[PDB]
Design a protein around this ligand. Structure first.
Ligand SMILES: [Ca+2]
Ligand SMILES: [Ca+2]
Ligand SMILES: [Zn+2]
Ligand SMILES: [Zn+2]
Lengths: 163, 5
C-alpha cells in the first residue's frame, strides 16, 4: 500500500503556512484558491495539523505554476511528459508544489487535467506521502473523488489521528 | 511526478 519518504520527514510544528505564488491562465485565481484549500483540507481533516494561508513572501509550502526552469534544479519540459512535482517536508524547497503551465488544467467544466485531483496528489508529497502500490489511492504513481482508505492509513501513520 | 532537498 502506501509509502512515505526515506526517514519519514514530516512537519513538526503545530501550524504550517502556505502561499499560492503564481496562477494559471486556464482558471480564475479564486478557483485555484478554493481548490487548493479543498485539497489541503482532505488531508488535514484526518490529522493534528493546521494550515495558515499567507499572500506575500516565503511561506513553508510555496505553491504555483511555471514554464521551464523556475529556480529549483528540476526544470519543466514543455507540453506533456512531467505535469507537476513536489518536495518532502523540510526547510527551503521542502514542502513546495509546482505545476507545469505548458499543460491544460480544469476545474472539471472543460478539457484538462483535473486540478483538484492533481493538487491533492502533490500536496500529499508536500506533507510527506510517497507513492502507493494501491491502484485506488490518490498517491498511486500515475494519473469526483475522495482519499482512499490507504491514503488515510498512511497520513495518520505519519502524524497520528485528529479524532 | 515526489522529490527530496
Ligand atoms: Ca510538461
Ligand atoms: Ca518550503
Ligand atoms: Zn519545481
Ligand atoms: Zn507523485
Amino acid at each position: 500500500g502506501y509509502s512515505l519518504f526515506p526517514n519519514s520527514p514530516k512537519w513538526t510544528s503545530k501550524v504550517v503556512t502556505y502561499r499560492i505564488v503564481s496562477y494559471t491562465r486556464d482558471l480564475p485565481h479564486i478557483t485555484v484558491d478554493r481548490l487548493v484549500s479543498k485539497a489541503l483540507n482532505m488531508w488535514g481533516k484526518e490529522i493534528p495539523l493546521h494550515f495558515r494561508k499567507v499572500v506575500w513572501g516565503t511561506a513553508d509550502i510555496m505553491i504555483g505554476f511555471a514554464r521551464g526552469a523556475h529556480g529549483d534544479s528540476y526544470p519543466f519540459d514543455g507540453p506533456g511528459n512531467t505535469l507537476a512535482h513536489a518536495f518532502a517536508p523540510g526547510t527551503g524547497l521542502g514542502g513546495d508544489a509546482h505545476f507545469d503551465e505548458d499543460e491544460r488544467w480544469t476545474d472539471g467544466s472543460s478539457l484538462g487535467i483535473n486540478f483538484l485531483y492533481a493538487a491533492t496528489h502533490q500536496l500529499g508529497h508536500s506533507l510527506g506521502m510517497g507513492h502507493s502500490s494501491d491502484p485506488n489511492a490518490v498517491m498511486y504513481p500515475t494519473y469526483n473523488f475522495k482519499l482512499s482508505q490507504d491514503d488515510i492509513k498512511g497520513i495518520q501513520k505519519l502524524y497520528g489521528k485528529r479524532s | 511526478x515526489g522529490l527530496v532537498x
